[PDB]
Write an enzyme that holds these catalytic residues in place. Structure first.
Site, mmCIF file in Angstrom:
data_model
loop_
_atom_site.group_PDB
_atom_site.id
_atom_site.type_symbol
_atom_site.label_atom_id
_atom_site.label_comp_id
_atom_site.label_asym_id
_atom_site.label_seq_id
_atom_site.Cartn_x
_atom_site.Cartn_y
_atom_site.Cartn_z
ATOM 1 N N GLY A 150 0.804 -1.221 0.000
ATOM 2 C CA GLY A 150 0.000 0.000 0.000
ATOM 3 C C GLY A 150 0.833 1.264 0.000
ATOM 4 O O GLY A 150 1.689 1.432 -0.871
ATOM 5 N N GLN A 151 0.606 2.160 0.985
ATOM 6 C CA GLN A 151 1.381 3.399 1.096
ATOM 7 C C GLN A 151 2.701 3.155 1.875
ATOM 8 O O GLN A 151 3.724 3.779 1.561
ATOM 9 C CB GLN A 151 0.535 4.512 1.734
#
Ligand SMILES: Nc1nc2c(ncn2[C@@H]2O[C@H](COP(=O)(O)OP(=O)(O)O)[C@@H](O)[C@H]2O)c(=O)[nH]1
Ligand SMILES: [Mg+2]
Length: 185
Positions: A70-71
């Site tokens: 993800g981030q």
């Protein structure tokens, strides 16, 4: 149970174990940990260590659940801080989410396969959510993760369902036995 059998094995050895639980968000890690620990490691028992890291402890057993990808960016600093000292690594994959297989493969090899730190540590892959009709086979997921390329690590991929319980304790017994033999060595 695996939780009870692991506790007795490491108590007999008179030592402490740490099990890492890594994998993408929504894979099923917190659900599996709550179920396999018969409640003991619920959300209202998690010592939060980071933005995506949770930590559990019960006498001589410690579990480290980390939502990867993800981030979130893999930093070698964060691995020493959270996962270093683990005796087994559990990679969890959502078999009904083939869109994110590209991402799970990249994070497995980034964090585990091409990680100098992870050595002879038994890596158990859980092809989770098999109960969903869109779930790809354990072999489909093994091909998606380029497991056929993993030549230097000790791994095992087992299909499971965290809702039905299907193959859960059975996959965990492979890891429990692999941890039990290598512990103290
Ligand atoms: N139907 C089904 N749903 C699941 C299964 N495993 C997890 N889930 C669901 O998917 C979500 C992801 O679980 P959770 O462990 O909280 O997410 P993670 O910690 O980010 O992997 C949960 O809300 C569960 O309800 C499964 O085997 N079958
Ligand atoms: Mg979670």
């Amino acid at each position: 149970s695996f939780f009870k059998r692991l506790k007795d094995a490491i108590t007999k050895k008179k030592t402490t174990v740490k099990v890492a639980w890594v994998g993408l968000d929504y894979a099923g890690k917190s659900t599996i940990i709550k179920r396999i620990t018969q409640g003991v490691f619920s959300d209202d028992t998690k010592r939060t260590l980071g933005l995506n890291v949770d930590e559990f402890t019960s006498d001589n057993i410690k579990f480290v659940c980390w939502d990867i990808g993800g981030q979130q960016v893999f930093r070698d600093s964060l691995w020493d801080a959270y996962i270093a000292g683990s005796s087994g690594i559990i990679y969890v994959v959502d078999s009904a989410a083939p869109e994110r297989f590209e991402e799970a493969r990249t994070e497995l090899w980034k964090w585990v396969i091409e990680n100098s730190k992870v050595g002879d540590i038994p890596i158990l892959i859980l092809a989770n959510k098999q109960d969903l009709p869109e779930a790809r086979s354990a072999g489909e997921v093994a091909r998606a993760l380029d497991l056929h390329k993993v030549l230097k690590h000790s791994y095992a991929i087992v299909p499971c369902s965290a809702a039905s319980g299907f193959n859960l304790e059975d996959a965990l017994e492979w890891l429990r036995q692999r941890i039990t033999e290598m512990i103290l060595e």
